[PDB]
């Protein structure tokens, strides 16, 4: 529960780590287990370098449409304001 | 700016003055301040409430 | 209405609410806040 | 199940049938208070403080002398555990003052970031803390002090350094300040990242976050709540 | 203390110049800037008896100017007297930082890409002075701004039609709401 | 360049009783009559008409009958009752046209600045509009033939002039003024959505029969030049109104801010004085 | 292309229109004088923006295969009309 919470908390919202912060936060300098991390979580083992991805967040815009779903909300919203006085 | 002869934003970093303004929105102002007065009136009806109860 | 477990159970004092928003902050000290001028 | 050992709160977790007409109008209030103490002692901040708040504003009257007072001392223990509480003095009965001689200095120790005072209030008032009997407060109140520090200073500066806040709150090393900032990202208060060479935080605040479509998301709940209370006043207008 | 026509010296005024001190010591806080020019520019009836006291006039015109090291000077004069005048001793602590932030608001209302150097001209070494000063102005619920260390941002902000004026209605009428609701729940049983 | 007129259905009840005549006189199935009136502006009003005894051969369909015993001396009658309400046009039923309509128009065009063949609706079940107008047109072509005269769609409505509701709104006995936003809007949603999209099915009738078995006005000059206007926004995936979505946040701005603020005042409106009246009734009923 | 990116770059213009960068501006200001297309052409990115145009003369294969826009429109605005009405169904009232 140290190591899989490292698997979570190694770049939650970090810039980048290197070999030495792996050596500090992780332990056992290099097994095939941090190599297994780099080949098991969908990871880019950069040039003596680390990144979560090329954008770390999978580019959030969420749809680029906040309008029509709240228009359906307006449908049932006006509907509930109807039938009542 | 502090005497409202000049409506905008100066700079020191990039040295770019930018004039713009849009103060009045009564849709916000008049409505919400009259609701504040409404809530004061409902607090004034809270004693009709506390009088019919006890 | 006492029906629960409980039958076993602004002079200087509302100024103390802003003063306990101030108690960890600059009691008076007046010299410090007057001698921060002349050290440069 | 409150006065004795705590085994059968899973019974409420599996058999939650707790919803009558809520008839006596104070029974439901103190009921939500007691189950707020439950969720306070299970583990909760948010839902527990909101049902404590609803029982607080659902105090029926003050027609019974000083009975809100001790029970309120134990009510806002979770708000003390928030760290975002000022001094609580508007509640204070003057006959409660001689019993909150610990509790006044305790919320003063919430406002202060001192460590020796954080344990000297305990060393001074552990017997009244046992009269509370709820050392879940002290098992997280140090963490609350460091979260108060991180909320204040991370709301304060855009690109602070971890060394500034660290050796401003006596952390003495970069890597436990890194674990503080990391578990604060994990606890999700601010964006603050690390310009990773030896620490030295590179970060930002968050204005221009959003302000227009996001209020009208919550305005559905605002006015749907209003129309719920409309129909409730209709079904209450039905009574005469 | 607006009127100032009928209180020359009665048997109740051992010093009308202490009334002049009492009107400046609160007009420097509460009075707005068009109100400031409207009182101590458009009219002189207090300005004769404080033109016998020029540093008071000087401090109010510097308040009208935004020059800040003489705020340190004459505010320190007023704070020496604020310890040495009665009806002030349970109350002086709010005054210092309140007048400071009363200048700091229009200070940030000047512009946005500000620093501590162009302000250190007015402050001296206001570098880690403004650390605790402005940071606890941020943490005292006051002084809407953003501030950075080495990128060194300053921010002036809060247009009034944004969210909180939209918020205050339900802020009243949620506690007020369930208040009147429980007051309408005492009625059944 | 004519938009709309004002229509009194009083002489459309004369169309109704001539629709009672044709059911019991003989072989004439359709109601053909003559539409009096007066050009006032591009907007217009009609006060009277009349209905010709008309026959029309199924063989060589240009066989009209517009008697001048029924035109000239009845025109003297209609001139004697008023000088104002003279000829303005004529009318026949169906929606489409028969062939002889052009010559029936040009017969009484000699009396009028613009005689109009308002094609009328006796058994209304239609999807669009009621009776509609056609003005004299010379559009001929881009080809340059002898001058075209087939009277083009230069539209009309059913306008309401003045009082008459002594009769009409006493004769209602059923209907109600909907305080708009009380399913009146979804009556309109039904009618304009369904009746404009099966008008679009008439358009796919055009754009399928004029593709399979349809020639010369196949791309006349106004099919493609309006497929432009159809090509305002026909796009493929979701049509990407990228400007208009934050601009629609700017739209929904005003609406739901009035919802939040104003409808919270509506909450105050109903709830506070409702609690007053309610609880007063409740315990002061004791 | 019916699709978007109607803030087109000048690149296809200067390649296939046998025109240069200094003359795309004349290419569309002379078209402003023509009056069949009136683009709001970008000039910080040099992009030749597409607004409303005068489309074609005849696309008989697209007069037949405009169903993917016409019947698209018909059944989809019809279906979403049925969906708006179907979510506000029983306030028929």
PDB file of N, CA and C in Angstrom, chain B residues 27-28 31-32 35 38-39 42 45 48-49 51-54, chain F residues 253-254 257-258 261-262 265 268 272 275-277 279-280 283:
ATOM      1  N   UNK B  27     -30.224  44.508 -13.964  1.00  0.00           N
ATOM      2  CA  UNK B  27     -30.699  43.128 -13.905  1.00  0.00           C
ATOM      3  C   UNK B  27     -30.129  42.400 -12.699  1.00  0.00           C
ATOM      4  N   UNK B  28     -28.863  42.657 -12.389  1.00  0.00           N
ATOM      5  CA  UNK B  28     -28.266  42.178 -11.153  1.00  0.00           C
ATOM      6  C   UNK B  28     -28.617  43.104  -9.992  1.00  0.00           C
ATOM      7  N   UNK B  31     -32.547  44.134  -8.962  1.00  0.00           N
ATOM      8  CA  UNK B  31     -33.228  42.909  -8.576  1.00  0.00           C
ATOM      9  C   UNK B  31     -32.718  42.400  -7.240  1.00  0.00           C
ATOM     10  N   UNK B  32     -31.406  42.186  -7.125  1.00  0.00           N
ATOM     11  CA  UNK B  32     -30.868  41.571  -5.921  1.00  0.00           C
ATOM     12  C   UNK B  32     -30.937  42.486  -4.703  1.00  0.00           C
ATOM     13  N   UNK B  35     -34.351  42.246  -3.535  1.00  0.00           N
ATOM     14  CA  UNK B  35     -34.520  40.998  -2.785  1.00  0.00           C
ATOM     15  C   UNK B  35     -33.963  41.106  -1.378  1.00  0.00           C
ATOM     16  N   UNK B  38     -36.610  42.665   0.304  1.00  0.00           N
ATOM     17  CA  UNK B  38     -37.634  41.637   0.482  1.00  0.00           C
ATOM     18  C   UNK B  38     -37.340  40.752   1.678  1.00  0.00           C
ATOM     19  N   UNK B  39     -36.079  40.361   1.846  1.00  0.00           N
ATOM     20  CA  UNK B  39     -35.702  39.515   2.969  1.00  0.00           C
ATOM     21  C   UNK B  39     -35.815  40.265   4.283  1.00  0.00           C
ATOM     22  N   UNK B  42     -39.434  40.072   5.019  1.00  0.00           N
ATOM     23  CA  UNK B  42     -39.817  38.749   5.498  1.00  0.00           C
ATOM     24  C   UNK B  42     -39.365  38.553   6.944  1.00  0.00           C
ATOM     25  N   UNK B  45     -41.928  40.054   8.866  1.00  0.00           N
ATOM     26  CA  UNK B  45     -43.077  39.164   9.016  1.00  0.00           C
ATOM     27  C   UNK B  45     -42.796  37.987   9.944  1.00  0.00           C
ATOM     28  N   UNK B  48     -44.970  38.389  13.032  1.00  0.00           N
ATOM     29  CA  UNK B  48     -46.293  37.804  12.818  1.00  0.00           C
ATOM     30  C   UNK B  48     -46.243  36.292  12.976  1.00  0.00           C
ATOM     31  N   UNK B  49     -45.165  35.678  12.485  1.00  0.00           N
ATOM     32  CA  UNK B  49     -44.968  34.236  12.639  1.00  0.00           C
ATOM     33  C   UNK B  49     -44.771  33.849  14.105  1.00  0.00           C
ATOM     34  N   UNK B  51     -45.562  35.491  16.616  1.00  0.00           N
ATOM     35  CA  UNK B  51     -46.727  35.920  17.369  1.00  0.00           C
ATOM     36  C   UNK B  51     -47.900  34.970  17.207  1.00  0.00           C
ATOM     37  N   UNK B  52     -48.113  34.431  16.002  1.00  0.00           N
ATOM     38  CA  UNK B  52     -49.150  33.420  15.866  1.00  0.00           C
ATOM     39  C   UNK B  52     -48.727  32.116  16.529  1.00  0.00           C
ATOM     40  N   UNK B  53     -47.426  31.810  16.561  1.00  0.00           N
ATOM     41  CA  UNK B  53     -47.000  30.608  17.270  1.00  0.00           C
ATOM     42  C   UNK B  53     -47.117  30.783  18.779  1.00  0.00           C
ATOM     43  N   UNK B  54     -46.476  31.810  19.322  1.00  0.00           N
ATOM     44  CA  UNK B  54     -46.473  32.003  20.767  1.00  0.00           C
ATOM     45  C   UNK B  54     -46.710  33.457  21.161  1.00  0.00           C
TER      46      UNK B  54
ATOM     47  N   UNK F 253     -27.723  32.852 -19.970  1.00  0.00           N
ATOM     48  CA  UNK F 253     -27.381  33.913 -19.034  1.00  0.00           C
ATOM     49  C   UNK F 253     -28.608  34.627 -18.505  1.00  0.00           C
ATOM     50  N   UNK F 254     -29.307  35.318 -19.410  1.00  0.00           N
ATOM     51  CA  UNK F 254     -30.426  36.175 -19.030  1.00  0.00           C
ATOM     52  C   UNK F 254     -31.571  35.336 -18.488  1.00  0.00           C
ATOM     53  N   UNK F 257     -30.702  33.530 -15.115  1.00  0.00           N
ATOM     54  CA  UNK F 257     -30.548  34.517 -14.053  1.00  0.00           C
ATOM     55  C   UNK F 257     -31.898  35.075 -13.625  1.00  0.00           C
ATOM     56  N   UNK F 258     -32.820  35.279 -14.580  1.00  0.00           N
ATOM     57  CA  UNK F 258     -34.172  35.671 -14.185  1.00  0.00           C
ATOM     58  C   UNK F 258     -34.890  34.534 -13.475  1.00  0.00           C
ATOM     59  N   UNK F 261     -33.019  34.515  -9.675  1.00  0.00           N
ATOM     60  CA  UNK F 261     -33.395  35.699  -8.905  1.00  0.00           C
ATOM     61  C   UNK F 261     -34.910  35.863  -8.840  1.00  0.00           C
ATOM     62  N   UNK F 262     -35.542  36.002 -10.005  1.00  0.00           N
ATOM     63  CA  UNK F 262     -36.963  36.292 -10.110  1.00  0.00           C
ATOM     64  C   UNK F 262     -37.806  35.146  -9.560  1.00  0.00           C
ATOM     65  N   UNK F 265     -37.818  35.229  -5.984  1.00  0.00           N
ATOM     66  CA  UNK F 265     -38.835  36.173  -5.529  1.00  0.00           C
ATOM     67  C   UNK F 265     -40.225  35.560  -5.670  1.00  0.00           C
ATOM     68  N   UNK F 268     -40.586  33.594  -2.658  1.00  0.00           N
ATOM     69  CA  UNK F 268     -40.978  34.511  -1.590  1.00  0.00           C
ATOM     70  C   UNK F 268     -42.457  34.889  -1.691  1.00  0.00           C
ATOM     71  N   UNK F 272     -44.385  33.102   1.491  1.00  0.00           N
ATOM     72  CA  UNK F 272     -44.470  33.854   2.741  1.00  0.00           C
ATOM     73  C   UNK F 272     -45.917  34.204   3.070  1.00  0.00           C
ATOM     74  N   UNK F 275     -47.922  31.121   3.837  1.00  0.00           N
ATOM     75  CA  UNK F 275     -47.793  30.721   5.236  1.00  0.00           C
ATOM     76  C   UNK F 275     -48.638  31.600   6.139  1.00  0.00           C
ATOM     77  N   UNK F 276     -48.699  32.905   5.835  1.00  0.00           N
ATOM     78  CA  UNK F 276     -49.563  33.830   6.578  1.00  0.00           C
ATOM     79  C   UNK F 276     -51.015  33.365   6.538  1.00  0.00           C
ATOM     80  N   UNK F 277     -51.584  33.291   5.326  1.00  0.00           N
ATOM     81  CA  UNK F 277     -52.977  32.881   5.143  1.00  0.00           C
ATOM     82  C   UNK F 277     -53.226  31.474   5.673  1.00  0.00           C
ATOM     83  N   UNK F 279     -51.457  29.497   8.023  1.00  0.00           N
ATOM     84  CA  UNK F 279     -51.368  29.234   9.447  1.00  0.00           C
ATOM     85  C   UNK F 279     -52.372  30.061  10.226  1.00  0.00           C
ATOM     86  N   UNK F 280     -52.714  31.251   9.713  1.00  0.00           N
ATOM     87  CA  UNK F 280     -53.826  31.997  10.278  1.00  0.00           C
ATOM     88  C   UNK F 280     -55.118  31.204  10.167  1.00  0.00           C
ATOM     89  N   UNK F 283     -54.719  27.853  12.781  1.00  0.00           N
ATOM     90  CA  UNK F 283     -54.944  27.925  14.218  1.00  0.00           C
ATOM     91  C   UNK F 283     -55.948  28.991  14.627  1.00  0.00           C
TER      92      UNK F 283
END
